[PDB]
Amino acid sequence: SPDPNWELLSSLGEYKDINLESSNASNITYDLEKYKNLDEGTIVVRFNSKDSKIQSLLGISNSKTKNGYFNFYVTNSRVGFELRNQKNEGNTQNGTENLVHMYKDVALNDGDNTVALKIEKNKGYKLFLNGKMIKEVKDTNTKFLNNIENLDSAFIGKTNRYGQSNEYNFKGNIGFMNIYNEPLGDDYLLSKTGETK
């Protein structure tokens, strides 16, 4: 990754017009090899939710575990992500590491919102929403997808988990999702997310 970061970069993944009105997530597991070893990157999502519960925009997980997952989520009044690893499979809490839970209480538009998560390896994390950098966390030992063992699922609109776990099914539409292998420039993220001030 250069310093400063690129202001415009080709996406690793780009997904559009995902209809989640009946809360049936979009399986993007075919792209999993692109993401599973990432130690940094950027995720940009345009969304409109019809619900107030915790809902995954993007869920990347080890479906053989309860708690081995990355969950980029929203509510009606909050955005954030969790990062958790689990070393033991099946119906158990054993071997769970709760790595990061970063979130911010926010005002959302009633219509479309645009959010971004920026991860800079061993620098930190930033959240953007509707043209603002809403939260920055400095961290000299960052964790991301490469820290979750045996990933096997990637979904837009849910997190694929073992057994009876809460999959955080999203209800509404996702206009777009763009995933990058590098941290993008703040100015790019401010303008891009800013399209839905």
Ligand X SMILES: CC(=O)N[C@H]1[C@H]([C@H](O)[C@H](O)CO)O[C@@](OC[C@H]2O[C@@H](O)[C@H](O)[C@@H](O)[C@H]2O)(C(=O)O)C[C@@H]1O
Query: Could you say which DSSP state residue 135 is in?
Result: E
Considering only 82, 114, 148, 153, the residue that binds ligand X (CB under 6 A) is: 82
Query: 113, 196 in Cβ contact below 8 A?
Result: yes
Q: Which is nearer to ligand X, 54 or 154 (CB)?
A: 54
77 binds ligand X, rule: CB under 6 A: no
Q: Which of 166, 187, 191, 195 binds ligand X (CB under 6 A)?
A: 166
Residue from the set 20, 43, 44, 54 that interacts with ligand X by CB under 6 A: 54
User: Is 166 labelled as part of a ligand binding site?
Assistant: no
Residue 187 marked ligand-binding: no
* Residues in CB range of 44: below 8 A, 6 or more apart: 114, 115, 116, 176, 177, 178, 179, 180, 189, 192, 193
Kindly report the number of other CB atoms within 10 A of residue 162's CB atom.
19
Closer to ligand X by Cβ: residue 108 or 184:
108
Strand ranges, E, within 62-164: 69-74, 78-86, 96-105, 113-120, 124-129, 132-138, 153-156
**Binding residue numbers for Ca(2+):** 48-49, 110, 139, 141, 160-161, 167
